[PDB]
Scaffold this active site. Structure first.
Site, PDB file in Angstrom:
ATOM      1  N   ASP A 190      37.707  12.685  48.327  1.00 23.97           N
ATOM      2  CA  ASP A 190      37.156  11.795  49.328  1.00 23.97           C
ATOM      3  C   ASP A 190      35.733  12.149  49.701  1.00 23.97           C
ATOM      4  O   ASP A 190      35.455  13.006  50.567  1.00 23.97           O
ATOM      5  CB  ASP A 190      38.077  11.804  50.499  1.00 23.97           C
ATOM      6  CG  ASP A 190      37.717  10.825  51.474  1.00 23.97           C
ATOM      7  OD1 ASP A 190      36.631  10.165  51.259  1.00 23.97           O
ATOM      8  OD2 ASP A 190      38.450  10.651  52.465  1.00 23.97           O
ATOM      9  N   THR A 191      34.767  11.501  49.055  1.00 25.14           N
ATOM     10  CA  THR A 191      33.370  11.804  49.272  1.00 25.14           C
ATOM     11  C   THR A 191      32.929  11.407  50.710  1.00 25.14           C
ATOM     12  O   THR A 191      31.879  11.896  51.158  1.00 25.14           O
ATOM     13  CB  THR A 191      32.478  11.118  48.235  1.00 25.14           C
ATOM     14  OG1 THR A 191      32.692   9.697  48.288  1.00 25.14           O
ATOM     15  CG2 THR A 191      32.773  11.651  46.821  1.00 25.14           C
ATOM     16  N   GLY A 192      33.715  10.547  51.382  1.00 24.96           N
ATOM     17  CA  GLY A 192      33.404  10.191  52.779  1.00 24.96           C
ATOM     18  C   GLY A 192      33.957  11.165  53.805  1.00 24.96           C
ATOM     19  O   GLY A 192      33.759  10.942  55.014  1.00 24.96           O
TER      20      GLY A 192
HETATM   21  C1  LIG Z   1      35.581  15.939  59.288  1.00 25.09           C
HETATM   22  O1  LIG Z   1      36.433  15.677  58.186  1.00 25.09           O
HETATM   23  C2  LIG Z   1      36.939  14.403  58.071  1.00 25.09           C
HETATM   24  C3  LIG Z   1      36.716  13.455  59.067  1.00 25.09           C
HETATM   25  C4  LIG Z   1      37.269  12.185  58.906  1.00 25.09           C
HETATM   26  C5  LIG Z   1      38.006  11.865  57.776  1.00 25.09           C
HETATM   27  S1  LIG Z   1      38.500  10.294  57.490  1.00 25.09           S
HETATM   28  O2  LIG Z   1      39.727  10.381  56.742  1.00 25.09           O
HETATM   29  O3  LIG Z   1      38.548   9.635  58.749  1.00 25.09           O
HETATM   30  N1  LIG Z   1      37.403   9.635  56.599  1.00 25.09           N
HETATM   31  C6  LIG Z   1      36.095   9.407  57.286  1.00 25.09           C
HETATM   32  C7  LIG Z   1      35.288   8.186  56.861  1.00 25.09           C
HETATM   33  C8  LIG Z   1      35.974   6.896  57.389  1.00 25.09           C
HETATM   34  C9  LIG Z   1      33.862   8.258  57.371  1.00 25.09           C
HETATM   35  C10 LIG Z   1      37.561   9.641  55.143  1.00 25.09           C
HETATM   36  C11 LIG Z   1      37.847   8.309  54.478  1.00 25.09           C
HETATM   37  O4  LIG Z   1      37.683   8.467  53.037  1.00 25.09           O
HETATM   38  C12 LIG Z   1      39.284   7.834  54.770  1.00 25.09           C
HETATM   39  C13 LIG Z   1      40.365   8.610  54.024  1.00 25.09           C
HETATM   40  C14 LIG Z   1      41.749   8.046  54.367  1.00 25.09           C
HETATM   41  C15 LIG Z   1      42.464   7.413  53.334  1.00 25.09           C
HETATM   42  C16 LIG Z   1      43.709   6.854  53.648  1.00 25.09           C
HETATM   43  C17 LIG Z   1      44.260   6.925  54.937  1.00 25.09           C
HETATM   44  C18 LIG Z   1      43.524   7.564  55.939  1.00 25.09           C
HETATM   45  C19 LIG Z   1      42.270   8.089  55.670  1.00 25.09           C
HETATM   46  N2  LIG Z   1      39.550   6.415  54.315  1.00 25.09           N
HETATM   47  C20 LIG Z   1      39.448   5.370  55.236  1.00 25.09           C
HETATM   48  O5  LIG Z   1      38.625   5.279  56.314  1.00 25.09           O
HETATM   49  O6  LIG Z   1      39.772   4.227  54.393  1.00 25.09           O
HETATM   50  C21 LIG Z   1      39.964   2.990  55.074  1.00 25.09           C
HETATM   51  C22 LIG Z   1      39.024   1.944  54.498  1.00 25.09           C
HETATM   52  O7  LIG Z   1      39.573   1.626  53.244  1.00 25.09           O
HETATM   53  C23 LIG Z   1      40.986   1.671  53.357  1.00 25.09           C
HETATM   54  O8  LIG Z   1      41.509   2.516  52.326  1.00 25.09           O
HETATM   55  C24 LIG Z   1      42.179   3.701  52.853  1.00 25.09           C
HETATM   56  C25 LIG Z   1      42.419   3.345  54.305  1.00 25.09           C
HETATM   57  O9  LIG Z   1      43.605   2.615  54.363  1.00 25.09           O
HETATM   58  C26 LIG Z   1      44.526   3.380  55.073  1.00 25.09           C
HETATM   59  C27 LIG Z   1      41.306   2.372  54.674  1.00 25.09           C
HETATM   60  C28 LIG Z   1      38.199  12.838  56.773  1.00 25.09           C
HETATM   61  C29 LIG Z   1      37.643  14.097  56.934  1.00 25.09           C
END
Ligand SMILES: COc1ccc(S(=O)(=O)N(CC(C)C)C[C@@H](O)[C@H](Cc2ccccc2)NC(=O)O[C@H]2CO[C@H]3OC[C@H](OC)[C@H]32)cc1
Ligand SMILES: [Cl-]
Ligand SMILES: [Cl-]
Ligand SMILES: [Cl-]
Ligand SMILES: [Cl-]
Ligand SMILES: [Y+2]
Ligand SMILES: [Y+2]
Lengths: 99, 99
Positions: free
Chosen positions: B25-27
């Site tokens: 997860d690059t985000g």
């Molecule tokens: C400080 O460290 C972290 C702080 C926050 C996160 S996170 O999980 O909130 N996140 C932060 C982003 C939003 C800036 C990582 C994301 O990759 C997250 C990772 C993720 C993936 C699945 C469930 C929950 C979280 N994915 C989602 O926000 O995805 C949303 C949008 O697309 C849909 O697909 C998956 C989600 O659908 C559920 C929806 C992780 C590490």
């Protein structure tokens, strides 16, 4: 481009005529922006991540200029803390992970 | 490996002796798992997802086996819907985005 991940992977994007920065996010299935206005009809949707669920509007067939490509994709609009480019858009530009 | 992003980028890892799968997860700045038990002291932390915040425990110096590499890193533990591998772990294995 090729980038490492020592910093947050922001890119500059023009979405529906509006300049924004957004995080290349391989953990996001869809693309999401706050504070843009897009024309035409939309459908309601919710999305979940850590913390909970965000209420959004879903717009189909929206122009997105990204990494020198012009793509037409789905965009969700709602009060996300950062804008994210999800896999739906990154597949259209042939993005890959190497690890 | 090199992967495209047509499917969710899951990888199999071993974290503190427990096998799990987690989303590259690059985000995500940090690495987060649900339902693992780690020994020793921890510090309280929150993380803001798209939703607000998830309460976690922060463990430092935890083993993670990922992509044929063994790294030591910080792991957050809390009720995330999907385990993620964030940039703190991915930089330790030299991951890159191409787009
Ligand atoms: C400080 O460290 C972290 C702080 C926050 C996160 S996170 O999980 O909130 N996140 C932060 C982003 C939003 C800036 C990582 C994301 O990759 C997250 C990772 C993720 C993936 C699945 C469930 C929950 C979280 N994915 C989602 O926000 O995805 C949303 C949008 O697309 C849909 O697909 C998956 C989600 O659908 C559920 C929806 C992780 C590490
Ligand atoms: Cl639609
Ligand atoms: Cl759709
Ligand atoms: Cl998938
Ligand atoms: Cl639980
Ligand atoms: Y749609
Ligand atoms: Y659980």
């Amino acid at each position: 481009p090729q980038i490492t991940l020592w910093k947050r992977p922001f890119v500059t994007v023009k979405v529906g005529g509006q300049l924004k920065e957004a995080l290349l996010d391989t953990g996001a299935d869809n693309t999401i922006f706050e504070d843009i206005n897009l024309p035409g009809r939309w459908k309601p949707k919710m999305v979940g991540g850590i913390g909970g669920f965000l209420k959004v509007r879903e717009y189909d067939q929206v122009p997105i200029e990204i990494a020198g490509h012009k793509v037409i994709g789905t965009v969700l609009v709602g009060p996300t803390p950062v804008n994210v480019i999800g896999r739906d858009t990154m597949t259209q530009i042939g993005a890959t992970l190497n690890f």
